[PDB]
Design a binder for this molecule. Structure first.
Ligand SMILES: [Mg+2]
Ligand SMILES: [Mg+2]
Ligand SMILES: [Mg+2]
Ligand SMILES: [Mg+2]
Ligand SMILES: [Mg+2]
Ligand SMILES: [Mg+2]
Ligand SMILES: [Mg+2]
Ligand SMILES: [Mg+2]
Ligand SMILES: [Mg+2]
Ligand SMILES: [Mg+2]
Ligand SMILES: [Mg+2]
Lengths: 125, 236, 63, 128, 112, 109
RNA sequence: CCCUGAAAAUGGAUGGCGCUGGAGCGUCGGGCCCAUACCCGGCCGUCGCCGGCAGUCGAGAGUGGACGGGAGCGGCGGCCGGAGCCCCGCGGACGCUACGCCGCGACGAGUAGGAGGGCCGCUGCGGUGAGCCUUGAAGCCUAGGGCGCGGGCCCGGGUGGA
């Protein structure tokens, strides 16, 4: 159960970073990096994540399925997107809103997706 | 498109009451009971690419900033400066003689023409007398003396809005790195239109000041303070 | 300067359970929501009772 | 030049000068670190006129403006590139600084990653 | 006697007090009387259902004066502008303590 | 070519007897010695012009040693001229008894 | 009212200077000056409302709504008439570490003493950071930059050598 697990790890985790007047959670499948019940990526049955691709270009989205809850080896389906930004977030937006897959991190994803894509394009001197 | 039909005797209160205006507005007889575009269809542009491309304006944003700022509340006031109410001091009337207190022409006596739409005062000294051209002044930084000359029935050209007197800027055409500083535009150019307009206004006001004796010398003078008099005792 | 006595200013009463029993913490969240979002006074006493100490929640004999 | 924060409100400090401990001046054995004077005759403990002030909660800075760096940001401590990524989503309300302990070669890589992540670094030129 | 100064307010005075510095005790909170519905939410049962009702209920004491006076927060006036010429002696002896007949209206104009 | 400002003397900060509030100063406009005549200067902007060592930039002018502390008149202070005024920074006490100008700035006349 | 009555020791006290059409005395007036007192406003914290937020419910909706004839009107389809389910757009800020976040009111002295909080601090231990570290740790110095009301802390530079 998410809630029971959240009480366990709300203040005791290896991913917890409590620094000056700040808290940050470093679990791999979390958006906004903030320690919160809503955004934690470990305790929820259905979770979403936005990571940079293995190569520099493109982004990767990770979705947790519903059957293999107890089996992390196949509890995440990862796919990569390497198209234009406007196409990406619109494509991303369809993963959450259209599929009703936790329509609360919808913007946290696209906001994170917008950030990572803007990171990969080269800096200007 | 009728007029207000409710004369105002004090700001916020009309002359008449609710019932009085109901009769005045004739509301008794006129009682009424009751009773695009986002996208555009562009052509196909084939061949065999059939299906007209339904293009939509205001395409979705290509990037979102990491956070943003929540919108402000509503104010119901705070109208922009363009539509502010222009208040002019009572002593300031078209034709009075003012004294500039702040700028390069500090202490100079000039005549006051009409007041601009911004509230700025458009005045000119009789440039032959004090070298003060048609130039805006602020009513809070001048002193309105008790001397007035009849500048009624003089034709101030209508094309003298604040935009006309607005300062012009040139920097910078296709230069960002600053290594060749511009040696031009430092000499501000007195445009011919300003020259002829200044002649046009001065040609008709100069006869009006020469009527009253020793007023040109009065305007040729510059106001000053002595170790004697004090402004709080002076009558201007 | 207003003359009042502040010794009774802070009402002393259980505001959250002292224990760290998470299961006990859980239904506290549940019943706190229940009393907040209902007019049922019965919830308030139950929510009030969940805070009180073991000695203040004496075991109730079957008989 | 630098990276602007989300907002730059007018930081207001209720007091700027530090609270120096009573009689820090006269004796060197007494450090400037504050201590509450608990004495029967202690004339600053009694809050006499024209004396050393006390700290008290009245000097608390604004909740919005607490812990603002002089440039619209808040601080965070990192020790290597890994903790920098948790800032990628704040990125406008918090700035990171390299810990004093981080060697040059590690810290050189971090700032590069920091620049490409649009993260404001308090001490970029720290080993160079 | 020496801690107070009291008199008989007039209609203008009672008007000024409740309007300029009138505050209500709603839910044991000092709430400014910025809206009439605040009065009705608490004093509607007694027929006091607008600003003017509170004035009328006070100026001439009504059957429900006690509730109305308790509803009003005590007025927190500024210091009397222009001084008061004494504090420790009675009004009849040139001070301010005690009962002045109706000059309390003057003092009210100087307080708020 | 004109003095263009009335001369004043910095007569001290607003103060009790054993307490002194530095944030407002007591100015003495020369030529006014009663409360009533203070209404003319009652809103005028005042300036304290003083010379320093290191040169400072000057608006519409070249850098020089001239610095200035700006301020404006707040109200008259007590029965005989003696206007009290505020400044952007509290006046340094070394300016006691020196020249303060009131600039004849914004005039209601 | 004033004078006499009326004499102490270092040189001295309406506080001093001085003050006599008053800067003395008695009764009065109008102004003016300021305390951390009072009014308003901003901020900090405490307490109280055992206040609000699980409705992230852009479709969510009830101060009753539902079926299923009843006999009727009020209006649009020539005197018979009756479904509309989102959408040309596929879209709609942040939030809720619930030990969190938000709102409002009042309040704020304090020895002895009691209590709460401390992401104040030291040392050692079980874990935890794919933690830091000879590309320089601890420590020490510093007119360096800062944070926190504070306990204290982070970073720059120098030395240092594990
Ligand atoms: Mg108080
Ligand atoms: Mg107390
Ligand atoms: Mg400080
Ligand atoms: Mg010392
Ligand atoms: Mg004592
Ligand atoms: Mg002693
Ligand atoms: Mg006054
Ligand atoms: Mg007494
Ligand atoms: Mg005698
Ligand atoms: Mg206290
Ligand atoms: Mg070192």
């Amino acid at each position: 159960s998410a809630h029971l697990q959240w009480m366990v790890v709300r203040n005791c985790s290896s991913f917890l970073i409590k620094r000056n007047k700040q808290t940050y959670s470093t679990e791999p499948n979390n958006l906004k990096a903030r320690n919160s019940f809503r955004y934690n990526g470990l305790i929820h049955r259905k979770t979403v994540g936005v990571e940079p691709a293995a190569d520099g270009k493109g982004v990767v989205v990770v979705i947790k399925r519903r059957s293999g809850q107890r089996k992390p080896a196949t509890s995440y389906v990862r796919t990569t997107i390497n198209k234009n930004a406007r196409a990406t977030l619109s494509s991303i937006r369809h993963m959450i809103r259209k599929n009703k897959y936790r329509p609360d991190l919808r913007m946290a994803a696209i906001r994170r997706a917008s950030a990572i894509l803007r990171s990969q394009k080269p800096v200007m001197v | 498109p009728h007029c207000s039909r409710n004369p105002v005797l004090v700001r916020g209160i009309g002359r008449y009451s609710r019932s009085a205006m109901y009769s005045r507005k004739a509301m008794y007889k006129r009682k009424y009971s009751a009773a695009v575009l986002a996208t555009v269809t562009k052509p196909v542009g084939g061949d065999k690419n059939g299906g007209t491309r339904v293009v939509k304006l205001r395409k979705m944003p290509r990037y979102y900033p990491t956070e943003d700022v929540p919108r402000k509340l509503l104010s119901h006031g705070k109208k922009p400066f363009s539509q502010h109410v222009r208040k002019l001091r009572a002593s300031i009337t078209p034709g009075t003689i003012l004294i500039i207190l702040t700028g390069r022409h500090r202490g100079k006596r000039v005549v006051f023409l009409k007041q601009l739409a911004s509230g700025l005062l458009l005045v000119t000294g009789p440039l032959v007398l004090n070298r003060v051209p048609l130039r805006r002044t602020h009513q809070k930084f001048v002193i309105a003396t008790s001397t007035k000359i009849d500048i009624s029935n003089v034709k101030i050209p209508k094309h003298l809005t604040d935009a006309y007197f607005k300062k012009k800027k040139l920097r910078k055409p296709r230069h960002q790195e600053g290594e060749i500083f511009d040696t031009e535009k430092e000499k501000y150019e007195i445009t011919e239109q300003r020259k002829i307009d200044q002649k046009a206004v001065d040609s008709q006001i100069l006869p009006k000041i020469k009527a009253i004796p020793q007023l040109q010398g009065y305007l040729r003078s510059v106001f000053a303070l002595t170790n004697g008099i004090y402004p709080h005792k002076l009558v201007f | 300067g207003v003359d009042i006595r502040h010794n009774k200013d802070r009402k002393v009463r259980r505001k959250e359970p002292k224990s760290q029993d998470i299961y006990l913490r859980l239904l506290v969240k549940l019943y706190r929501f229940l009393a907040r979002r209902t007019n049922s006074t019965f919830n308030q006493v139950v929510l009030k009772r969940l805070f009180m100490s073991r000695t203040n929640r004496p075991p109730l004999s079957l008989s | 030049a630098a990276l602007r924060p989300l907002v730059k409100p007018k930081i207001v400090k209720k007091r700027t000068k530090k609270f120096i401990r009573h009689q820090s001046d006269r004796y060197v054995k007494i450090k400037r670190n504050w201590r509450k004077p608990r004495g029967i005759d202690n004339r600053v403990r009694r809050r006499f006129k024209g004396q050393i002030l006390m700290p008290n909660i009245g000097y608390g800075s604004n909740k919005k403006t607490k812990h603002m760096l002089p440039s619209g940001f808040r601080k965070f401590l990192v020790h290597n590139v890994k903790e920098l990524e948790v800032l990628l989503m704040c990125n406008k309300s918090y700035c990171a600084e390299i810990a004093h302990n981080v060697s040059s070669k590690n810290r050189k890589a971090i700032v590069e990653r920091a620049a490409q992540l649009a993260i404001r670094v308090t001490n970029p030129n720290a080993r160079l | 006697e020496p801690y107070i100064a009291w008199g008989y307010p007039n209609l203008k005075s009672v008007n000024e007090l409740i309007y300029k510095r009138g505050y209500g005790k709603i839910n044991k909170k000092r709430i400014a009387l910025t809206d009439n519905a605040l009065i009705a939410r608490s004093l509607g049962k007694y027929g006091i259902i607008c600003m003017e009702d509170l004035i009328h209920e006070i100026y001439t004491v009504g059957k429900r004066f006690k509730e109305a006076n308790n509803f009003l927060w005590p007025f927190k006036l500024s210091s009397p502008r222009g001084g008061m010429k004494k504090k420790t002696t009675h009004f009849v002896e040139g001070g301010d303590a005690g009962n002045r007949e109706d000059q309390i209206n003057r003092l009210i104009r100087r307080m708020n | 070519s004109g003095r263009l400002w009335s001369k004043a003397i910095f007569a001290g900060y607003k103060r009790g007897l054993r307490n002194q509030r530095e944030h407002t100063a007591l100015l003495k406009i020369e030529g006014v010695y009663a409360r009533d005549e203070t209404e003319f200067y009652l809103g005028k902007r005042c300036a304290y012009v003083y010379k320093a060592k290191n040169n400072t930039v000057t608006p519409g002018g070249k850098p020089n040693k001239t610095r200035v502390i700006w301020g404006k008149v707040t109200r008259a202070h007590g029965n005989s001229g003696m206007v009290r005024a505020k400044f952007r920074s509290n006046l340094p006490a070394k300016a006691i008894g020196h020249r303060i100008r009131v600039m004849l700035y914004p005039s209601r006349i």
